[PDB]
From a paper:
[name] (Bc) encodes three FNR paralogs, two of which have assigned distinct biological functions in bacillithiol disulfide reduction and flavodoxin (Fld) reduction. The Bc [name] structure was solved, and [name]-FNR1 interactions were proposed through protein–protein docking. Mutational studies and bioinformatics analyses confirmed the importance of the conserved FAD-stacking residues on the respective reaction rates, proposing a division of FNRs into four functionally unique sequence similarity clusters likely related to the nature of this residue.
The [name] monomers consist of Fd-like α/β-sandwich folds forming a β-barrel at the dimeric interface containing the conserved Asn-Trp-His triad required for the catalytic activity in the heme binding pockets. Bc [name] was crystallized in its apo-form and reconstituted with hemin, the latter yielding red-brownish crystals. The electron density for the heme groups of IsdGheme was, however, relatively poor, and only 50% occupancy could be modeled, with apparent density for the iron ions but limited for the rest of the porphyrin. In addition to low occupancy, the heme groups might be bound with different orientations and degrees of ruffling. However, after the addition of FNR1 (after 950 s), the breakdown of heme is detected in the enzymatic reaction under aerobic conditions, confirming the importance of FNR1 for the degradation of heme in Bc [name] and the resulting release of iron.
Numbering used by the authors:
A (entry chain A), B (entry chain B): 1 to 106
């Protein structure tokens, strides 16, 4: 299981613009081995906003299948480019090593 | 829903020791409002290992309850510094803004 994150440093007060763009049903959710997408807003950021798009996958090849897909090319078409309010963008890949679920579900 | 993340930069090759410490049943899974814990290993880190412990909570109050509990005290009795392979420690808090679950492609 892997998580792929795209973390955007955004000019203060503009985070909500990037969140609104992901706040809708899309195509990545239909891909094989997709397990979930979440959008996070970092707390306590002083001079900027930080918005994280996180996607979780059975395996890296499932993510790679999506980035080759047509729907990825359709969802990376009319973006209006990278918005001006985006100061910095980091991408990271994580291996999930331990998962500990609640007792209320056990 | 919120996420609290502790990110440890570790001496390259020693990340498995921290992962191992969390690879067991603990007491945080028993806390009210706890929704899950996972441990991540960042890919393609050059000089070091990076291990992230992420915990998910229904509300900030639930996490606060946990940090005020005798279980958190006892787990953080410490009274002696961290292992020498732990180089740095960063804590972050996130608000979950959007959740998109897998969907049938039809
Ligand atoms: C490298 C610079 C990148 C920029 C500037 C960028 C920006 C954007 C923007 C503004 C959208 C809105 C269009 C839409 O959501 O339909 C979008 C689509 C999307 N991007 Fe990126 N992105 C980048 C790379 C990435 C990466 C690394 C991921 C990894 C998860 C990713 C995942 C997505 C997803 C899931 C969507 C939505 C597709 C859907 O709705 O099905 N993107 N991108
Ligand atoms: C800032 C300095 C910190 C140090 C030196 C530290 C150190 C430790 C150590 C050595 C353990 C081992 C106890 C065990 O394996 O159960 C532990 C437990 C743990 N710590 Fe930290 N910690 C720190 C902060 C935090 C914070 C702020 C969080 C917030 C989420 C956190 C999350 C956890 C979790 C989830 C556990 C395991 C709880 C369980 O197994 O029931 N740590 N801590």
């Amino acid at each position: 299981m892997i998580i792929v994150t795209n973390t955007a440093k955004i000019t203060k007060g503009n985070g909500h613009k990037l969140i609104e763009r992901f706040n809708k049903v899309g195509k990545v959710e239909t891909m094989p081995g997709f397990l979930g997408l979440e959008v996070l807003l970092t707390q306590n950021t002083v001079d900027y906003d930080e918005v994280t798009i996180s996607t979780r996958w059975n395996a890296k090849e499932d993510f790679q299948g999506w980035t080759k897909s047509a729907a990825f090319k359709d969802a990376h078409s009319h973006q209006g480019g990278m918005p001006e309010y985006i100061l910095d963008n980091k991408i990271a890949y994580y291996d999930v090593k331990v998962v500990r679920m609640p007792m209320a579900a056990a």
